[PDB]
Design a protein around this ligand. Structure first.
Ligand code: NA
Length: 129
């Protein structure tokens, strides 16, 4: 599924991401925009052989099981394929554990490089929330 900007903002809010660990909804929408372009089916191979899955490009190195990432963990206790669902529940639940792990949204390098410190409220402007 490719979400609209306001459609994803609404889904993230419904799933309790809005101000989760102090990150306003604009931060989550901005991160999703640059990680996946709002496409739940996005996958990208990392040089280390891990893979990133879904709207928030969650990495098989630590967070999900894809069966092809040697020496990796599955800290969200999920098949990485669950991160590709049109339903964002598994991505949201797993993103709550990632952003809780000590470095907040810096875990998303595209968030650090493209969202952090910017006018992230612009990402939910005009949305009926
Ligand atoms: Na893994």
């Amino acid at each position: 599924k490719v979400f609209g900007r306001c459609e994803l903002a609404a889904a993230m809010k419904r799933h309790g991401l809005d101000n989760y660990r102090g990150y306003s909804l604009g931060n989550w929408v901005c991160a999703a925009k640059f990680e996946s372009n709002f496409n739940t089916q996005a996958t990208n191979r990392n040089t280390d052989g891990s893979t990133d899955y879904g709207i928030l490009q969650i990495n098989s190195r630590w967070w999900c099981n894809d069966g092809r990432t040697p020496g990796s963990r599955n800290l969200c206790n999920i098949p990485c394929s669950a991160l590709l669902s049109s339903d964002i529940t598994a991505s949201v639940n797993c993103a709550k554990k990632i952003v809780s792990d000590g470095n907040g949204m810096n875990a998303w390098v595209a968030w650090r490089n493209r969202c952090k410190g910017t006018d992230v409220q612009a990402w939910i402007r005009g949305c009926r929330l």
